[PDB]
Amino acid sequence: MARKRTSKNDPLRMYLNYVRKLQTMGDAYDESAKYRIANFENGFKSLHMVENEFKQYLANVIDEAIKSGASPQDLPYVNEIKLALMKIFTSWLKYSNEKLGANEIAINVAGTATMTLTENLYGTRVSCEEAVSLINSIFAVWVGVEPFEAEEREGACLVTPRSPLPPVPISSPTGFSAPIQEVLQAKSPEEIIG
Amino acid sequence: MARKRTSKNDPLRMYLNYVRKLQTMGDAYDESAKYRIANFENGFKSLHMVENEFKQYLANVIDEAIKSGASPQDLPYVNEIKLALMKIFTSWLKYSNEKLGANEIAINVAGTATMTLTENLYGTRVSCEEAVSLINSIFAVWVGVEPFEAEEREGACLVTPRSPLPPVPISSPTGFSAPIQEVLQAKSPEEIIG
Amino acid sequence: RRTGITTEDAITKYSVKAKTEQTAYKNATKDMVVQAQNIMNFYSVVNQALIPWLNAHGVGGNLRILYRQLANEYVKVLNTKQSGEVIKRLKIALRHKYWLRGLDEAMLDEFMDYIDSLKSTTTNYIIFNMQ
Amino acid sequence: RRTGITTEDAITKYSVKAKTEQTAYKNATKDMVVQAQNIMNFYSVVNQALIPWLNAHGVGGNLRILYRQLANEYVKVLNTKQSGEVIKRLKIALRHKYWLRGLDEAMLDEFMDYIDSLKSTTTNYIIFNMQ
Amino acid sequence: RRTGITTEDAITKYSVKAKTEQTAYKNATKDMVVQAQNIMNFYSVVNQALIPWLNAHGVGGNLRILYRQLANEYVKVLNTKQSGEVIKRLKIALRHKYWLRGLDEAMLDEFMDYIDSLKSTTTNYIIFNMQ
């Protein structure tokens, strides 16, 4: 980037600077490819690992609830309610992916929990208290905290934290991963680097 | 991919973005071929194995029912009723092919059972209770569960689960299968890899 | 043609047809240009009937898709040319199926009474015209 | 399409599509020129309603952004075509969320009573015109 | 976008964007020609109000700049569109800040009473004109 001098609130300057720099964006993207690809290479693994860990630990908690004698019509969690719980855990991935403190992660994930459990559990058979008990069970499996206390005090559901929350136990590495054919066909280590 | 920012429900933008990207789809398909072929190579085997296993176990259950003294006019199961039962088992292949939990597989297969046994057994001599007993017998052969309870409570047939359902006992491998001529004509293992 | 075919024959077909199937997709782009506005007709006639219902009956943001799953499957059954004598059965089938995926029946009775204003969508957009 | 896909397949897609995605961005510039004035419409209709409120109710310099976070999320919920029956719930949801990030409720009750003059922004700016 | 990014990624961006950022500055010259007269408007409306005050109240040569630091920061706060309800707080903030840098308060009370005749400066000088 921004002009970094003053706000100068004026929409026509915004659109005109955008139209001016459209003749340079189309080449800066082509230049940006060369580090774009490697940063996605070592950034997508965190998403895919946290989504598989959510699937696995949700399956374990639901099966331990079924072994207590409940019916599989009592607890659906099929397509969109799992998508809600993946929304809160992926926002936990984001605020852990920055170098934030514990309670700042806790209250940002509590805000995302408020928005998500407000939106998509009206009209679908699942009260908010059961969903928040499920979220506390999943965090008891991951890091063993159970941080969130909830209420249905108004027409929406509201989530507030009780204790600070640790970041995700997954490190995003700064690697430069090379293929096995490049390892085998090379003649020297410096040919792999250089 | 989608714009991933907002919905912005407007059909003319949909058709116009499609017309804009038709001049790139025709090359992205040609580029996609190189991994398309190998992923189909190791993905079609699961379909063909589950369809042969359905044919075999249906033949075994029907022959054990004939050995109890029934007539081959009592139980047709010729062309389209087998196609119905293959619909429910192929949807079981899909929801097992994702890393879903047990009861989520159970209720999605129960929903596909509801749709399929609603559609194509009105007007064809086979009541829904006999078909659901046959499905429970086939799952007793495969994994030994018998999960589905049914009813003809309304004009359609309705299937609901009683117990969680395990995924399919078939693993889809991430291979890179090479021909035997490439094995024999090569001079080194790295010539097969590289 | 038969049915019973080995695993190798289907893979042999799909692997050897790569050149012809991609040079057929290159012409299917030309065909898709005029036929692609069935997307526009479909989302026009679905949003024009569902945005006021979902928007004024109180359902949230992310459950609107599950309601779209129900309405879109009903519109598919419609525009495969299937009128009311099958619809009076597939409505209660879809009601039980999307009740089983966690919806509430106090929404479902009103929604199944609502979906009779959705109709068929797809038309043809290429005329022959020998001249 | 499925959901469950390995880590290698997505990386293989994103790595091999580089040439086609950049030569599609080169045409998306041409498309962005006429569509980019939704930025102008958005900041016009947001500043025209928030600059007097923030400016005369006494809030500082650097907290104006946190108030913009609230107002901008509300305008997103609006111009995804969602009327009052969801808004009467998302207002108290956003009130609790931005109370939780350290605001004061004596500002929030008046601000939530204020944001009903913000409406939808985005329109379409490309007509077909077969002639 | 996130925030938390390594030291190497930012340096990698700034080093590899050199060609595009200089060929964008070459067009920003053309844009700067018509927009650069905000400098003229700014120093006109600041000197026309400060040259008689500084010149007739008795302040020296080289302290005029420190008074310009105060007045220029006030004009920045103005032309970021911020009216009196924030100004009634930032005036005493700036009074304490430039008292802390060694000025005299017998000048500062009269000068803070004086700076209400400074107003916003920057305008836009490029019209669209589709014809």
Residue numbers in the entry:
A (entry chain C), B (entry chain E): 1 to 194
C (entry chain e), D (entry chain c), E (entry chain a): 4 to 134
What does the paper say about this structure?
By trial-and-error, the correct symmetry (which was 17.14 units/turn) revealed a largely α-helical protein capsid, while incorrect symmetry values gave rise to density that was uninterpretable. The three-dimensional reconstruction showed a total diameter of ~270 Å, and that the nucleocapsid within the outer membrane had a helical pitch of ~47 Å. The asymmetric unit was shown to contain VP4, VP5 and 12 bp of DNA, since the 3.7 Å resolution of the reconstruction allowed building an unambiguous atomic model for both VP4 and VP5 as well as for the DNA. The DNA exists in the A-form, as has been shown for SIRV28 and AFV19. Since there are 12 bp per asymmetric unit, with 17.14 units/turn, there are ~120 asymmetric units in seven 47 Å pitch helical turns. This means that there are 1440 bp in 127 turns (120 local right-handed turns and seven right-handed superhelical turns), so the DNA has a twist of 11.3 bp/turn. An interesting difference between SFV1 and both SIRV2 and AFV1 is that the protein subunits contain N-terminal portions that project into the DNA groove. In VP4 no density exists for the first three residues, but two or three residues at the N-terminus can be seen partially inserting into the DNA. In contrast to the compact dimers in SIRV2 and AFV1, VP5 contains a small C-terminal domain containing two short helices that projects away from the dimer. This small VP5 domain makes extensive contacts with a VP4 subunit in an adjacent helical turn as well as with the C-terminal domain from two other VP5 subunits in the same helical turn.
In this paper we describe a novel filamentous double-stranded (ds) DNA virus that infects a host living in nearly boiling acid, and show how components of the virion (proteins and lipids) can diverge considerably while preserving the overall virion organization and mode of the dsDNA packaging. Like most archaeal filamentous viruses, SFV1 contains an envelope. The results revealed that the two most prominent bands contained proteins VP4 and VP5, with apparent molecular masses of about 16 and 23 kDa, which are encoded by ORF23 and ORF24, respectively.
